[PDB]
Symmetry: D2
Subunit: 462 residues, 4 copies
């Protein structure tokens, strides 16, 4: 009808019903992985228990979003089916999908596609009882705590050390889902609050450092940064001694105090006590309106001339010494920061790259708040903001604004990377008359469904 | 009837109906003036729009004087004033009706409304606009004032009467003096007229001896003085700032601090190489746990021991001089402030006191906001917050918390002072049998019967 | 001789020689204790390093008692203490010499130095380290204290005596009680031990009834209480902060403010199109110069009049509820604070007063800084700042300005209290002819002749 | 001797004697213009009065700086000669040079090179007496006041309007010297102080807008920005109404107050009165450690259910409306700023470009402070910091740090641009055996001087 149409070659919106905004985010992100909807659109329950109605509804939904000419579709049928908190709410959906696909596998020798896609394996090391510890687990979504961390690697390197037992990556799923937990108990409020420390994550993540293959050097490098950090702090402490220099409560840069004392000393002395009161052509390097150097009250009274040379010598040589000291300390600090940055930049460490595919963001109170998600359109190679009906050509800058941290009252609660060395997640199969060719990516039952809905919409337009 | 009765010997509240919060403030403030209530209750129109409103108002007054219910309703009377509706005009119409009605009560000689005597007076002018002299007297009911950039009410009044270098002068002042305080000033950063929230101090008792023509010469002799004094004072302030914010560059520091810091930097032990690197009973005056004297890193590399004495001498004597200069300038500035405060403190200038009777306060946007009032209970000698139903034994501290501004969203938009040299405004006259007001006995018999009928109906309403 | 004489009946200053600013503070503070001066001036070594220093010290005392010069020089005596030099030890050595010398004045029975009685006492312990009990008594001259994160001196003493969940208890206390206040704490941001500049309040009079073993049961019963009380109080504070800093996001605002602002936003008139675009005598209660009611731009586009009453009702009742909640919680918190203050206020706990006699204060780096002292003149009942030559009638306000900290670079490093239940520390004994100390007549004849010779020499020095 | 040698192909330092730092700055900048030292090194006083000794000393100095193997030379002989405040001190030097070259011209028909290089002509318009005003002047160094100005063009456009008479450029010297005056009377101090507002200037300056040729449109454009500015402010005022919205003294963003009120309303109601008190596998999109939604004290007590839908509808629709309003206002403001930026970007306005050659900077008190200067080495195309002896390979970033404004207690007091369409200022003449070839750029007397000094230095090295 009026502005309800879907623009050509544009993403389909999801209707929000009863605060279902979280469902739209997770569903639009999972649909966007091409491999996943090729995996679920080609799904018929084997004839050979509540997973099947929801699953069929989800499949019908996927076809509608994929093929409809409507700006947005309604997930209400599928949303109502998931009946049995938002965490466990998503958990039930995922559980249903993994077990429903579990049923589909037949014959062979007793793996499900989804556990391939979202799960892997990781190691362990001895606990503090004097006994070595070795174990492996599925670790589907890796949780992370954003307590005083600046980037994602600080977060991971802390979430994997867990006391001086360290985990290590053995098997990596093609899609890697990180959780970012902003909830920390606030004493000043006496309630668990979402901390608003900004956390940086990159568009592409090199996971080579956290896998066991290179383990030998990573700690052999980790230790080093520790040493380096135990060095770096020293400099900082020394440098602050130059920037915040003072006996008492108020501290000023030492160069400033030296310069100001020298200016006071060289100021014209005032023996008198306080509280006793056409166009001119210009030379190229002359200073106009230079104020007359009459005495002002702050200058010293006695001013021995012999001493003045002492004061100038002492203070200027010391000020130059201090300037060079500070510049050397800052150069050293900067180069240490540089080495720490790029010590993982060697070619052996850049072998495994995971590209960011989705970020799910949440605003408001913990129990109830708005949810939306940024995803990557690979064809146009553009970021897209999905928020219920609205799907917009967002940019990585609006992405960083909403998702990163203490910007504009928002936070990213989940990151979804995909491996770049395995492109089958985005690949589309040959149509054989030219690939995915849109609507013709679905089996005939969905085809007739979407065509009937589109003809109904054409009648509705009048 | 449950928790709706009036506690014994307590003021009564006014029901808030259709945003009557402003009307409750104005009415409670005017009623608590005892002379006014006595003027209103003793009022009969000569049988031979104001008359309906006025009878409803006198009935309201009798009710609120003698009721047993915790709050009465002005709905009947408030409905009578019919013409984001403007409240200033609405407030004006009640006044206008009242003193026109009291004006209608004239007999004998043509001249003498009681009201105009109570709330208006007259004041002088002068003329310098065309070099032509100007002398005029006007009526100045409720003198307006602007609070922009003013600390106390005296500053505000001086500015409100100078009005360009034509000065006004007080000649006749009513016993009830009403000052308007207008904070509405156009904010450029918003393109809208905002209520500026500068704190404005007013006293519990105001002496206007400076402002009447009787002492006009002296105030003019004295005002000029403070100007000179002020023009002098700023000089000191300027120089004092030089000591407190001393620096060539963008960051400025107290000069004594820079001297002490530099000196103790020179005193520190030179450090080379830059960046590269039971219970012990205590003596009565011993420092405990002092840090060692290891040469820290920020210190001069080479110090001539002979030149260090030069440095100590000069910096110590300079720091002492600066300390003495700053303390002298501060004593001088404090002295000037004290003289400016006490300038009008002499006996000749302390003879017309005006006690603060009420203040009317506002909270919110100009067009639509909340209103309440603070009124002095003279018998118990306590401030009382009148806000709709709620009548409370407030304190002058909560007064300044709401009235002054800069505190929450509260502002004081009107100040009603009463003169102290005539207490007939608060006199309750005398009843011979009691050996004074004796509360409810003041009202006439018609109001008396009314209040008793309401009281008996409330009795019936209580039982259940 | 020009402006170097002592004004009549005035204290004398001490010359600063080779950084003796600390020595002047300690010496003026100890001398002004009258009992101490009387003990020192009446001292003869038994003829039958401390003896030279001590005679020089008694000569210094006599000079400064009876001189006519504005300041005497401790250079002779200060030179005697020979061993960025440490001052804590330097201060210790003088004490040590003094009470060893006074210890040498024993006759008859083996036991009883006057000094140790004056500056030391004894205190209990308890033991929980190994589950094994511990009871011990030590001598605790000049009890040390740490000022880290403490508001008053009672907090400081409680912390300095709990020392882990082993608590100390006072059994014998000297009439002169010296507390050390150590601000030296390692600053991580600088890698250096810095003097933390938290303000620390101390009173002019200290009641230690809580700290002696006599009332140990009750303080233990009461301390636990405040803990509970404190543990309760924080709860309220937590909840109160929720009202004052209410927000899901990074920016938090008072909840009453958000409610009022949102309500008055809904009240505003809807504005469409977004971005695209004589003297008038005043009535007594009229708003003047109110801004017009033009619909400004930030306002809801479409408002259902029926739903606006819902909105007004809910937001007004919620704002009133929040106001009452906040005022109730604030009254409760204030109540708890008052009870914690008055907990020790009962008569049983107010019986051992200690008047603040002196405070020794420091300014600058730990190793090298400036020292001066504040000492009470009991006769004139006024605080007096003793700083080298300069002796001034300071006030307790300048005291708190220098001693408390957080003010300039000043810190208070030692507190010397004296007991009030025995005034023999300030008694001047009696002279029969005068019908008391009568100033200089206290000193013995040798010191007397000395002071008179100096005075006559000063007479000769004056003439010119 | 020890570290006094000059590195090969490196700039020569100037010795500081008696606070001559300003002299080093001005002299090193004037020497750097190639044309100028080709103009003064080829100078002999005509045999045919104090200008000549100083001039010869300056010429000998130039040869020494140009040819010496010493790290730095002493200008003391030349500095002492200028005897007769720093403004007038520079004025005397310039005056001496202009008149000394004035003498050199012979025959012809009664122009001096220096007045060509540093001076030009500008126009005027009627004063406020009802009478038209037309005039022209030499205007050597154009003064400028940096009172509340962000860039150099705001400064120039204000210094040329001078009341609603406007100046206009008729003749432009190849080198253009601007003065930046930071001195303004400070009432809080009662003394003239150097204001520390940062002022931006560009590496290249298009002067096409301030010349008379295009005058007709420049005002025709100036007026427009005025209109645009008189429009732009409106939006800003409107936008602040959204960002700082409040009755009283404390004002918060309106979106924040709406969101917070909605959260409070939807919070669980508390009828009770205040102050009355292995590793688990993770679902990919589940939120771990979500805090339990137990009541907290701030929630409302009565909560009519019917009204709650009212509150949600009202507040969320209003919050979305406000968000869209603010985004539209910000888009409009940004595009207006863009048009104002690039309205002078048309090709007709980019015809005249002046490249920055030097900036002279000063720190400290007005009467006496340190002076140094940044210049452009065109051969290496690198910025260089000249500060007495030290000549260093500075960068435009250290340039912006010291020179621009309220960074690190420094200010630029003079700008020296050179025209780019006239490169003869940097061109060097053909040596004819290969151009300037360094030392061989000077006449033989200077040649023998520098060679003798270099041999003396070689003897001195031992």
């Amino acid at each position: 009808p009026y502005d309800r149409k879907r623009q050509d070659k544009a993403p389909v919106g999801l209707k929000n019903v009863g605060n279902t905004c979280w469902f739209s985010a997770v569903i639009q992100s999972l649909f966007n992985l091409l491999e996943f909807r090729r995996l679920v659109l080609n799904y018929k329950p084997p004839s050979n228990h509540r997973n099947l109605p929801f699953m069929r509804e989800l499949r019908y939904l996927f076809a509608l979003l994929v093929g409809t000419k409507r700006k947005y579709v309604d997930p209400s049928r599928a949303v109502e089916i998931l009946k049995d908190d938002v965490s466990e709410f998503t958990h039930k959906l995922l559980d249903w999908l993994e077990d429903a696909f579990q049923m589909k596998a037949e014959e062979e020798t007793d793996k499900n596609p989804m556990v391939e896609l979202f799960y892997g394996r990781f190691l362990a090391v001895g606990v503090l009882e004097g006994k070595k510890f070795e174990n492996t687990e599925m670790f589907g979504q890796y949780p992370l705590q954003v307590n005083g961390f600046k980037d994602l690697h600080e977060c991971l390197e802390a979430a994997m050390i867990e006391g001086e037992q360290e985990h290590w990556f053995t098997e990596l799923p093609p899609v890697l889902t990180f959780e970012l937990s902003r909830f920390e108990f606030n004493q000043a409020l006496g309630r668990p609050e979402k901390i608003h420390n900004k956390l940086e994550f990159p568009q592409v993540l090199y996971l080579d450092r956290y896998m066991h293959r290179n383990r030998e050097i990573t700690r052999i490098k980790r230790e080093e940064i520790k040493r380096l950090k135990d060095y770096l702090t020293v400099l900082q402490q020394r440098l602050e001694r130059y920037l915040s220099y003072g006996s008492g409560p108020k501290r000023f840069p030492l160069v400033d105090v030296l310069q100001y004392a020298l200016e006071f000393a060289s100021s014209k002395p005032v023996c008198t006590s306080p509280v006793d009161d056409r166009s001119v052509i210009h030379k190229p390097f002359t200073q106009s309106r230079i104020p007359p150097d009459l005495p002002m009250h702050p200058a010293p009274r006695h001013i021995t001339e012999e001493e003045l040379s002492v004061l100038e010598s002492c203070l200027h040589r010391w000020r130059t010494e201090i300037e060079n000291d500070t510049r050397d300390l800052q150069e050293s600090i900067s180069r240490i920061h540089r080495t720490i940055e790029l010590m993982y930049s060697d070619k052996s460490m850049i072998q495994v790259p995971y590209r960011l595919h989705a970020v799910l963001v949440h605003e408001g109170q913990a129990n109830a708040g708005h949810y939306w998600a940024y995803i990557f359109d690979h064809r146009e190679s553009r970021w897209m903001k999905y928020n219920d009906i609205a799907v917009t050509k967002s940019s990585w800058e609006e992405l960083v604004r909403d998702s990163f941290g203490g910007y504009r009252n928002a936070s990213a609660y989940c990151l979804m990377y995909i491996n770049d060395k395995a492109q089958f997640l985005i690949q589309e199969e040959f149509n054989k008359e030219t690939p995915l060719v849109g609507i013709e990516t679905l089996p005939p039952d969905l085809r007739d469904f979407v065509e009937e809905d589109n003809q109904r919409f054409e009648k509705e337009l009048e």
